[PDB]
Design a protein around this ligand. Structure first.
Ligand SMILES: [Zn+2]
Ligand SMILES: [Zn+2]
Ligand SMILES: [Zn+2]
Ligand SMILES: [Zn+2]
Ligand SMILES: [Zn+2]
Lengths: 367, 367, 367, 367, 367
């Protein structure tokens, strides 16, 4: 069929770049509503308003309620209309950015996304994961276009807990392996077409960047300072992993992540930490070479990601729980079917237990 | 500085994709202005009208004057304002596409670009090219956004004259060496910042795609058929070249192309045919290793591109003419100053004469 | 799915091996029906009768009608029931061996296969190609088991025309590429399942043996002497190629070969000669790397196989004839759908014209 | 000599494949006798009867006594003849399968072999192994042909004790070294001739598979689940090890195995466990390179196989017990003579003590 | 710019070479002033006077005060002028050698430099290093030419404390990384121009020598004996490190060294010991590949050099003391600007903390 690649129109990243929000956003619109994370605004609202004023723009700073509900979308739209805003800027965590994207869609205005943590691949994407109130996956919610601009302040991001950066590494570690399987299987990407050569290049660039700079970036994040290794990992976590998964395809890792949410044991863990184990489960499922799985297992453990089920607090009734996880992964419309050859709930259940047994041996041999 | 990458929102390519212009373009607008020249609508108008009709879209045909003049934009803006057009769709060659991107800027509406040839990297960029009369350079006129959508029909491109695909390979072969040179020097790219890891990976992917698929794509182009090698080169000529040049950087290869237009001898040669010689010039200028120059010289000769000044019909008064080219290439605002250490016109003059010597010997002793 | 590999019960190979047909076939049955045409029985009958007599076996000679038709199998059935034969020995070429294979199936008796040429991979397979009485194709008859015993006399094969051995190399040379395609796409082999690791091992062993012994074997072939290189190409032409295609899978090359049969120009050319050009076409279709295509075209030229359409006497009205070959190859049930991603007739048409252009240039620059 | 390769007619493996036993066995006969051990029929009988009945077949379930004796073969021959059985299906472990294969031979009917464990290379072979009543090796009993079908349910095999899969790895691990030895010496294989290229590739593929998948398979075996690595190892344990030892040849490894049965100490250890030490002994005997011995020693220990005599419970009066093993291995009719340059009992005695010291040191440095 | 490489006129090294000081110095002058520290003349004076006297030279022994002050230079200038001295010979450590070189400059006479330790790259250079009286870096004082002769007695150097040879390794270890940085950025070297090829080869040769001979040399140093490895390291510590830093350029390593002198904690540590941590800091700053950082960290620790701040006694109030180091390194007139893309004090501060964490972890895994 057709080959399609989607991208945000502009990706900018740099230290203290929120000082330049005004100059970068001015071409898009003149009247902006800012849906700001309460924590981000507590320490930076002054400089955001100054950045806009110095560029001759008008702002309506709107503290984000916290949840990405339709109530909150409606409330924010009223503010935006009363102020006659022509574009939305979301700045903060994922729930903040997902709201800004939904708002600007309903208002048919351009959107700017400014993540303040590099913990998932969601920002650049034209997507949204819809979740039941029990913490279990439901559906992917698509949007007609990607954000117009993504702006990443690497100094703000370096301030977050390093666990968040590692969770982004976990979500990005999957990119190459799931896009590669979609290429092998002739699967359709979330952009609606076959793989381009470009998307597969970025997905493989993502994986290699994490291998070469993951541990060094983790060192800078713990000190909350910016080094070039950190910059590269933030780009891998945001642009590369975003364009890679959307335009290269999802497969077993994210299906296993959605399957893990169907049990409450790992509810208190981040997206990327569950994806980290889904990658390892995909490598067993597709019988990756022993050298490949050892590398992925070693980098994952080197940044604190879980490589066994106990590290996601799954410790009792493991078999019963893994049947639920496996059936959930194989549900209708799930991405596990993009695996070369496909996968059966008996097959995913096997890989779960075997990935776990492999992770346990690696932690033993590391001592 | 910040690191910035720009891209069209969506890039689609595939065989007979014009039949699906309706469904791809619908989420962007409903009432469209189709801009094309007599030849282009000769074979497309019927299928374009039908695709938009079955999708519930209103289409307004508007033949093109052949040149990207301000009078043509206002004229087309009138027809579009009268028909209440929501988006502009340009279909055809560079002039048509540059017109459609310039028009939709003034009207403040989305644009879709449907190139019917892969001969320059212009389609994806947020850039026109401003020239003189009889002469051929003025400046680079910038744009605020990249095209909303680029849709390349590979069956249409396969029907074009193969010489036009070699021109595209010429314009694209320069991408990696110019972006590499900007990475080595810290040059600001036309996206406004430093190189992203992503921009450099697509620029290198462009070079390797031409190396591995270039001649295979030419076999298909001369038979006017679509093979996977042809699709890969089309993507390298359009998307990889367009993003790689604009977000990777320009250097001496396009400055020397721009100087080659200050003399009249090569006016009957295409854009990428003169870039082909500017790439070799830059490889002499930067003293690229011999294995690198030979590889670029051999591929260029394999697809019919010029590697000497006589192949651009410059056979008389060569030093005096090359002094004009050199002085033009080093003019203020030209991109040759992005080379590591810069470039004096004495050194560009040197590089032109030595590059021409190299090609003469390659055509003799090294083929 | 299940993974299945099928093989003949015993494959025996040696010089002057028909002298030992009696002791090899003795444990299967005592009364044997020997099917063979006039030419083969002309040089083999006396030797078969001696070997069977000294071994204590009973022979019933049954001269072969010449066609592998249903009526010819029925006729040989009556003859074989009247002589109360316990097994069937077919000796000679394809249509004979195919007739003996199907006859022993309907009679529920062992079969031995004694090829006197190594020109196709048919002998070892559990398949008989059934023609009408007048000689037109009828159906592919799938047998439930492979030949109980296959006995190849290398000296007899050395005496045959060398053009036949080169045709065998053509048929075998498709083995590795077609099975690798079926592995990538997950196709079902003619053995009813997915690829075993063993079948793909033998498929690739076949390809390397042709690369390493092909030229050396043809020297022994044209001198009608037996050398170890000839003994290896015979094994590759018979057992490796046979299990390779049946348990590894068929794809574009044999599909394209059937399409060439629709064109009447290449009628006076052999199976493997048409298959050789089918392999080149598949390599263009699947965009195999230039180094791979070059290696295959070089080996094909070294053994006299056709790498252009004019070497198959297809010189006039080429675009019309290729549209017929392409339609015939993409027909229902034809193995082109085993390609990764499948192939449309327009894609197979394109590959056919480009593969021909490639071989033309290879022939031109090799001289 | 003639080069000969034998094989079972059809090899099938898959998870839950006993559900499809009927369709696979359909073309062989309508009325089947099922020889099953009492334990195996406990979980399999109900499923077998449904698979046969739904396929339009007729089954007669005959529980297996436990031993492969002539009295047991005669007793089962009665049941089959009274029930007018057209073929024999054995299902279970080695003694069941060996019985089935013999019974079908005397009745002159086809046989299907469904092994429920992958612990030995004997399924798929056209032979039995004769023993005394003290436990010492007697001879090999050769059958005329290999089984008609071998059907391996991988889910059933994963449920077996993991020690049995490791015993299969120990048996299969010798395949390559003994076939390579026979090729080097030009010995005659159990299939009656010289090595074919096909058999050496299958022998080597066996070794490489165990190296690459052996540890991943033991993870899934110990969880009693099916992963692609466990399936590859089962195919290596059964088909590759089967064709490889029979048509690639035996040498010192199995000779040294038979010697170890001449002493009572290693009676509690399975077949493949003693073959494991035989392979190390052969590697000392033929003076394998120190990197080759270590790789084999490491893989053996990684899956629990003995690499010292004490791990075979041979701990007292070792030089006495090894002289017995040495002369037993060197006896008339043993394969030790297939070693390049042969081997005297003094030489094998040397290799036994030295291999033991090697493994003791390998284990000592496991700290 | 112009490419420039400076050097001392003659570099001589050998065991017991102070016995030959006279013949080597003969052509420079007949009447010499010998500036010697009181300790150095203790073992050297008697030998020096005999080497000079036997060579027909005339010597005036002037004991060195201890400091390189103008009052000391004037005092020695008096002694020399009264004794009608034609050249100056300094013999001892850094302050003696720096004094000798300055004195000869004011008198306009030749100078010979005989270093008794190999702890720094300053012998051979055409410069002094100016300091405050608290211990903080002031500036560099440039001399017009390099010394006329540098004569290094390797036996004398082997008698020095081994810690001093390791300090020379720490100084020399930076030569390649700083010259490579200056080459990359196109910075101007201390010799006034751009890097020559000769200087980069000497810079890289320095690094490779320390890698290959560093540990072997520290064995002989700690035994105070002369081996070829100790001689190669002395040449790398003195000549290669000398020409390499002066005509290859300085960057972040020595800039970070000067910062560490802005705080009092690391005062008990020699020059090269603080440069050792500066090299690690530069390697973080420029984001060197993780294999390059580790090789340098490993070699440093192998010879006793600091790879953490605590090993420089910087243990309390670290973020405070590092901000001082950072701004000191980034001051005007410092070489940090020679880094590709330069470096802000925030960036150097990042690199200081991160490098420290890296070394702490390198050391932690030393168990
Ligand atoms: Zn994710
Ligand atoms: Zn261009
Ligand atoms: Zn064929
Ligand atoms: Zn065995
Ligand atoms: Zn220094």
């Amino acid at each position: 069929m057709d080959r399609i690649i989607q991208s945000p129109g502009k990706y900018i990243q740099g230290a203290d770049v929120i000082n330049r929000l005004g100059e970068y956003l001015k071409p898009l619109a003149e009247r902006w509503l800012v849906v700001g994370d309460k924590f981000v605004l507590g320490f930076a609202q002054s400089t955001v308003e100054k950045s806009f004023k110095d560029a001759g723009l008008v702002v309506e700073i709107a503290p984000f309620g916290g949840e990405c509900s339709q109530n909150e979308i409606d409330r924010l739209r009223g503010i935006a209309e009363t102020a006659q805003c022509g574009a939305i800027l979301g700045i903060g965590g994922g729930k903040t950015l997902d709201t800004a994207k939904a708002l600007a869609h309903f208002m048919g205005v351009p959107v700017a996304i400014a993540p303040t943590i590099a913990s998932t691949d969601a920002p650049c994407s034209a997507l949204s994961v819809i979740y039941t109130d029990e913490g279990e996956f439901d559906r992917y919610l698509l949007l007609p276009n990607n954000p117009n601009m993504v702006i990443v302040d690497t100094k703000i991001v370096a301030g977050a807990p390093a666990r968040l950066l590692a969770a982004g590494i976990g979500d990005a570690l999957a990119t190459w392996f799931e896009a590669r399987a979609c290429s092998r299987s002739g699967a359709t990407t979330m952009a609606g077409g076959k793989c381009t050569q470009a998307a597969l290049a970025l997905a493989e660039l993502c994986y290699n960047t994490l291998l070469e700079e993951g541990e060094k970036a983790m060192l800078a994040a713990e000190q909350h300072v910016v080094t070039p290794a950190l910059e590269r990992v933030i780009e891998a976590n945001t642009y590369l992993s975003g364009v890679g998964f959307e335009s290269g395809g999802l497969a077993a890792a994210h299906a296993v992540h959605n399957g893990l949410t169907a049990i409450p044991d790992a509810h208190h863990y981040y997206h990327g930490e569950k994806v980290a184990f889904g990658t390892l489960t995909q490598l067993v499922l597709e019988n990756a070479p022993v050298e490949e799985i050892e590398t992925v297992a070693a980098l994952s453990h080197a940044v604190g990601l879980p490589i066994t089920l106990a590290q996601l607090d799954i410790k009792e009734d493991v078999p019963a729980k893994m049947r639920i996880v496996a059936e959930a992964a194989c549900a209708e419309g799930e991405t596990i079917h993009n695996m070369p050859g496909g996968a059966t709930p008996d097959q995913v259940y096997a890989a779960l237990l075997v990935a776990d047994q492999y992770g346990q041996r690696f932690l033993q041999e590391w001592e």
